[PDB]
Curated annotation (Swiss-Prot), chain D:
Organism: Geobacillus stearothermophilus
Function, in words: Hydrolyzes the short-chain alpha-galactosaccharides raffinose and stachyose.
Quaternary structure and interacting proteins, as annotated: Homotetramer.
Transmembrane segments: none
Protein name, as recorded: Alpha-galactosidase AgaA
Use in biotechnology or industry: Has properties that make it suitable for elimination of D-raffinose from low green syrup in sugar manufacturing process from beets in order to improve the yield of sucrose.
Similarity comment: Belongs to the glycosyl hydrolase 36 family.
Amino acid sequence: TLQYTAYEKWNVITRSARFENKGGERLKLLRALSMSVDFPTADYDWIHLPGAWGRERWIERRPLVTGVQAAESRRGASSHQQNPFIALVAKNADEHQGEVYGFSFVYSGNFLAQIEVDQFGTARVSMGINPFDFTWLLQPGESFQT
Amino acid sequence: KQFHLRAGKASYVMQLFRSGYLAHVYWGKAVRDVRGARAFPRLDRAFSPNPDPSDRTFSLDTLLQEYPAYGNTDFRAPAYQVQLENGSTVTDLRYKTHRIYKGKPRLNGLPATYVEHEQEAETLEIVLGDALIGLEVTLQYTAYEKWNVITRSARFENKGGERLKLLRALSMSVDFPTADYDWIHLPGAWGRERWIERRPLVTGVQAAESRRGASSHQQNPFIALVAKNADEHQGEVYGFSFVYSGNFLAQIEVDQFGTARVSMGINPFDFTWLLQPGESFQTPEVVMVYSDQGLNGMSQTYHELYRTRLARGAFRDRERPILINNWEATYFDFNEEKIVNIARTEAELGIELVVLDDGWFGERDDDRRSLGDWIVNRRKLPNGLDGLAKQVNELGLQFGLWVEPEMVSPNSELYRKHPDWCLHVPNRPRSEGRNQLVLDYSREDVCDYIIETISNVLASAPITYVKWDMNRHMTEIGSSALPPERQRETAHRYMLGLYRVMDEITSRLPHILFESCSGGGGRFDPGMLYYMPQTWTSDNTDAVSRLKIQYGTSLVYPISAMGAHVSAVPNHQVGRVASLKTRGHVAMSGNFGYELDITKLTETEKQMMKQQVAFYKDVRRLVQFGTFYRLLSPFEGNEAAWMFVSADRSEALVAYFRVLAEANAPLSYLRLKGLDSNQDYEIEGLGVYGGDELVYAGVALPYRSSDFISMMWRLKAV
Amino acid sequence: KQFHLRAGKASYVMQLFRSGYLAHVYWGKAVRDVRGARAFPRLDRAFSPNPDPSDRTFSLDTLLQEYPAYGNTDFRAPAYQVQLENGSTVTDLRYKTHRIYKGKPRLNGLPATYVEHEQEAETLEIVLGDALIGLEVTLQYTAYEKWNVITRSARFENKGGERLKLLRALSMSVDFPTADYDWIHLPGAWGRERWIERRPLVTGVQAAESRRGASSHQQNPFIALVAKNADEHQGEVYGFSFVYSGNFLAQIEVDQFGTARVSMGINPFDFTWLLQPGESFQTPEVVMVYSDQGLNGMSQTYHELYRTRLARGAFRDRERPILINNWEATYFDFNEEKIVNIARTEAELGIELVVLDDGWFGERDDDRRSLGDWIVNRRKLPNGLDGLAKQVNELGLQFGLWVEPEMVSPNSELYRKHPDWCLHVPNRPRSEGRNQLVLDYSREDVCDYIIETISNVLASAPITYVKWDMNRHMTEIGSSALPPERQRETAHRYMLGLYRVMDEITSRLPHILFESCSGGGGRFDPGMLYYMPQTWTSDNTDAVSRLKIQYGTSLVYPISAMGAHVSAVPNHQVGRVASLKTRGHVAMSGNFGYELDITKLTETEKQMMKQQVAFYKDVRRLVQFGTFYRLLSPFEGNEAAWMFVSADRSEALVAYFRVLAEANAPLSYLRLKGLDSNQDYEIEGLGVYGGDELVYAGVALPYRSSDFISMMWRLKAV
Amino acid sequence: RVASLKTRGHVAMSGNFGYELDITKLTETEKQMMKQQVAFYKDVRRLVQFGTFYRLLSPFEGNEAAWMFVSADRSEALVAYFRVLAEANAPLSYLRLKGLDSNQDYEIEGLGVYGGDELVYAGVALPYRSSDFISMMWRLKAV
């Protein structure tokens, strides 16, 4: 079940998914991201928040690449090193004008925030619990909420 | 003490400082008031000398100015410079008086933006003066009501009893407090005029200029300071447009303290002007435009102002005729029988105007003779211009004529009779471009002769269209009718003559639509637009080449004046093969016309042409008089896109272009501008879309192959 | 008819084209032959007019030239321009003859790079000429055998019978076939001179220039064409250094056809020069360096050339004394005892020179008076300069003196006696800077006076060091001893006079080390370097600020001439607190010295000074005369690093700087240059590293917290 | 790094304000400075912690950093400006604001009354200052 919520007051769209095993066999979640969205074009810059202890959340803006880009955490915590937030930014956009698409993860553990540009210039922004070192077993009757 | 000009949604503020000094403070979006109470004290800047020895905090080197001079403690490039009889170049202009009156004054012997009603603008005249030498300088400011336009010019007058030589006389100068801008000018050449060149500013001097006696293909008299993030659709832009068609200097200087001095006017290089007691000198005007709407906002401001308040004549607000020029069909070799029976087919295709090009006069079989001898060749036109024009008229077409009045061929009746009438210098060889010389328009006799000769030729037949051409640039600049101390005034006096010549000629013939031309857009400037309501954009007629040229031309000049014609293939300039459908769409994006041999066209092509002609007539008033938006830039990529929107936004026309085809290409999309978001639009042949969707989301573009493709969409509000 | 200059590993090729025209062909890496200055189909370019009317392909507008003019079909900015009596500015120089001789000539009344032997260089003089007006221009080319150096200058001579007036007379002009380069110039201000500014070329005009009568803090007389991918260590770089200390114009012009014109010389603005029949005019020279080995390679060429073949005197090849200036100690209020007392303390620390600053002359107690009156104040110095110097000498210290001979205070005996001896113009207010006026060095009486006055004073005491200073820029430029027609020659004539003053004064006192100064490095140019072998780099003595300042200055001028003094904190210019350790390391990267109140220093600080002085004495020869490589640029990041390597590469000194501290910072590394890869070097205190490892792999940097850090390593071959 | 107590306060007041220093080791001036700081923050606390935030100048893009807080009705504002590395003989500085009501006038405390549109479209001149790591804080109230 895909969960969409749209606030009336803000330009906020929240997304999450709920897995349920209604069958008779074990289903093993190798990957269970909260969301994924395919942009029709890929002419963008992206912004994530890299850093370290004593210097968290430095704004880093980079052009997109044909391939994969990702800020992630494998530390069991959201981390000083990469904050669970990425943003698609228009080429000419700044602090005061321009189109911006922010992605914020409401979770304090391992995360993956990825942007993939394919052969046809489409951009897939996917975000959620880091698939790395992660599985989740669903017995019949069990559920998983991202 | 404080002057506050309010033009449209913009503000231009100045303030009188201490005793007579005029300081610049602010220019940008309109504010109610700029607080006069200055925030923090001035500084004692090292090596910035002081006019007042007691106060080291004051220095003209560190004062934002309106019309600065050099040698008085300011070390930056001045707006003007005057040499006295004693050899010094030091002058000191102080405030005398100032006046404010509704409307806009005319400029003496010079073209200028105008108003038709007093309510349309306010004019501020600040009278400055140097009492010692008796030099008076009046700074002229005009602020329009409906536009963000501030026009600036200067007026010198010698009230002293000495000779005053103007070494430099720019129209304007302005000091920005900060220098964090990029700058855009329009460099180019013949075949590729007005390419948009965006560059970061350097700490020093950058300048676009012309030393050719004409505004030139090489540099268009327009520069602009633009914000670092400003684009076509947003950001702050500061336009500077010179209303003049001769030599010019458009300069930006960034100094040690991060200020940017923008100056514009008649190129000081190889230029002087002598002022005897009682004599005056009026500078051409510079049209300054602000916009936080981006580049399109600036251009649209220029478009309305230039089309409705710079262009003149009966054809100013009128739809321009779809013409055809028969240059490739006949060349210098033509006759009456050949033109009229060809013009009969052209009339049936829908053409509204047939233009007779070069070769109708004197001994014209070459481009190496006969310029200056403007009499009908009875050998080619036995019944003359009168006979040809009337025979053309009864087929239902207007008749046009090509002229090049500013030129004289060494092999001509005129030159053999008046060899001293050309621009020349004593005992030097007379250089030739295209085997021709330049006539001396600094002289009254030469001008008077041309006015009479050309007007009589133009009155001898029902000619309603004129292509005024110039195909050379000035060399050996001098006059045999000028004293040695006024020889450097020749270039400007020439332009004054030409302006006066055109002014009288166009006045004698109010029934004629005039189109200026100079080897293409050699003189596509505001100055020429005042006399001739349209211009030949470029000799290059390639559809793909025209993408850059027209895109860059539209930056300042209205589409109504931007001439664009469909030509033959393979192209004569580059050898490129584009589709007839593509060449039409590019040409229909400007002042539509034709330049090709219709007899060489296949039967299928003639039908394309008939549909092109019929289609343009439907979209003409929208194209030529509508609001213009640049969507995709050919300078920034493989695509070119723009659109025209009606005043009430109920109608729109979209043009898209893609040069080099990509195999297995990504899907194409196009977002539009200037539509009513609260209203729905029907795209002919596609369906109905919301205005908000087209602008915010965009339209999926059709997947197409082959190089040099084009697409046109008529948009209609439901 | 081809001229082929061979300088080091570089080639400069020219050619005689058609009827006496001189055409540029190639400049870059050395070639045995240029076969291809012969066969090339020339194009008929639109609007490029023709000297020979029947050939439309040939135009001066489209010809790469060496000394071009305007009005002869060339529309680009010319190298020269001269107005005739009839008013015209048209001139036509044709090839006359040429001569080749080994060695390099001296420029009349001007400084110039020289040779000690004929074998060091070869000189090509190309004599052009305009037969009509009798104008003869001789183009001077010199190619050094040992370096990639080509020097260019021009000599005008009126061999006709009319007056020739030079509107423009640049030292050189060169037309590159392409324009795909970036360009580097050195802008700045007082307290921040010569910041490196890299910019892409624009299609139009870019320039660095000075209208201040001095080379200026604002713009240094140096520009450079660099390849797009060129950096400090590799790539093609073309340097243009002007040997002149006054007004200049350094300009690059890119035309419609993608050619880049680099021209340099005396600024045409506010400049003329009258040439009566029989008179001649010599332009200063421009030193051109080619390098395929990066910015370092270009700079290194200049370093050797300027240190060994431009700088003169007994101190040219000599180690410079470590000096102390006690200006901050006493200001204007001092006496003989107070100076000698502090001299003992400084002498104990190891300092070698004590310099007496401003306030020793006349009634100089402020900065509002006494300039021009060079007589010992008997209140402060009862025993005169001789008595003070003698005492200082037997303390073991050399003695130095501060002078500002070009300046006159309105409140001085000199000015109330000779009010016409200052630069001024009739009936205009005499503007001041730092409450002082500029003496008229265009006049003979003034120069001879200064020459006698300063010489006798400098010979009256065992003075072995002089600091020559100027703290003002020209306003109201003019001379009472000049006719109106020669008034605009004043600035250049001033500079010619100054050059003669310095030449005669320095010649009288061969045992005196002269250091040029101008509110810091306001006159840090090759012209001054010819008369005074070292220069005060900047009044900004802040360690961090000096990173950029010394980095940019090092781009052209040798380390031996770059004065750098350790000062007190909080820094008087920026207010920054940097460690004495860091202030030392920065100052030790140049001509080391001190400028601070020793009486205000802590005992810990004074001990660091002794260690400092001892250290620099070990590395002095290596620093001042060694090879200089820049590693990390402060203009490009948070770091600054460079190193000095001996000729035999057996010894090296490495300097590193970080300015802003970073918490939990990444591990730092540093890679070196110029070492012998096949040799092992011991880094003192660290260990032994291989030269290849040092250059290819690099060294690990220590982890340091705290702001503004510095580090020095001594390298020695095993 | 050594920065002025004034500067350390202006940065800390830009967020959730607190103290992390030994008072037993403070001079009388510093303790009196702290008291002045606390009294100031309590005045703009509701504005800082609950007002609208505008970033003006990025410390990631240059030598400056600036941001401002604007109240809901735009009748009140706090402007914070920071400059790290001192430049000798530096150019004149200016600051443009955001989120103000163009139709209203604002009193910048201790400076005078400026128009809202002026502060946003023209900008206000900044004081010439030396020393490293400086800060400036302005309170704005509508008339």
